[PDB]
């Protein structure tokens, strides 16, 4: 539906090297467009797509400069929460951040979010009101109190309602030819021998974007969800996505079954068959 700009930070303390590795990736909808890794000396905020390259030197200088200070704050972060949880300095830990903005039909902030996790579990999060925080546990409350006292909320709110939606709009236009044109799935139904002999129908959906899609099987309308195999949607490697669904069918009644495909790149639901 609505477009969105999202940033993902992953900080990992390396008790063996003495510091932390900071990795940050950026996404417009299902497209990664920027990345940062401090693991390499002289790390920069780098482009991931053609359209983000038309940015000036100043844009990269200031993103790099920003994420650098941020990596440092996350390094201190790992050490701080380590203390909150009374954890030894012997193990490695992870501090993740997840924030962004969903642009509504109006072209305004429809949804703003910012959440943090420590060792893969909710730590602290900004509420939908962008005015208050929810702490997952006792330790998180220590931060919640510090952030309320600092009025940290109004700063996240202002970024989400301002720069985040403005950037997103600017990006959607810059990468208009890719971010705003839908790429319908290429489809086909293959037929392979299976156990007990044994015929399995497999419905492929290839090279489509965005990620969201629906693949179902139907014999006479009756859904076949229960005894069908569906795999997680996976990246193609070129920016598009893949997915298939399969079900065993009686050899001789294959055409009784139809594959139903739905995608925002198609004007209408697609009906598919072994032919």
């Amino acid at each position: 539906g609505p477009h969105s700009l999202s940033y993902f930070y992953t900080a990992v303390s390396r008790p063996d090297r003495g510091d932390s590795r900071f990795i940050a990736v950026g996404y417009v909808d299902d497209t990664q467009f920027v990345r940062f890794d401090n693991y390499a000396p002289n790390p920069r905020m780098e482009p991931r797509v053609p359209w983000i390259q038309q940015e000036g030197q100043e844009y990269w200088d200031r993103e790099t400069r920003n994420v650098k200070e941020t990596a440092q704050t996350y390094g201190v972060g790992l050490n701080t929460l380590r203390g909150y949880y009374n954890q030894s300095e012997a193990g490695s830990h992870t501090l993740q951040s997840m924030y962004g903005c969903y642009l509504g039909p109006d072209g305004l902030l429809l949804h703003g979010y910012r959440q943090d996790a420590y060792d893969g579990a909710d730590y602290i999060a900004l509420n939908e009101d962008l005015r208050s925080w929810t702490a997952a546990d006792m330790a998180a409350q220590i931060t919640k109190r510090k952030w309320e006292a600092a009025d940290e909320a109004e700063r996240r709110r202002s970024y989400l309602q301002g720069l985040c939606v403005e950037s997103l709009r600017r990006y959607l236009e810059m990468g208009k030819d890719t971010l705003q044109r839908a790429e319908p799935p290429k489809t086909h139904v293959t037929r392979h021998p299976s156990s007990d002999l044994g015929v399995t129908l497999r419905c492929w959906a290839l090279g489509f974007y965005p990620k969201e899609i629906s693949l179902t099987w139907q014999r006479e309308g009756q859904d076949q969800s229960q005894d069908m195999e569906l795999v997680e949607t996976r990246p193609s490697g070129d920016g598009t996505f893949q997915k298939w669904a399969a079900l065993v069918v009686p050899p001789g009644e294959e055409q009784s079954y139809t594959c139903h495909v739905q995608h925002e790149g198609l004007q209408e639901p697609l009906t598919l068959r072994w032919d």
Partner: peptide, 9 residues
């Protein structure tokens, strides 16, 4: 545009 550096935890 990433969000500016946050507050200390």
């Amino acid at each position: 545009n990433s969000d500016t550096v946050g507050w200390s935890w």
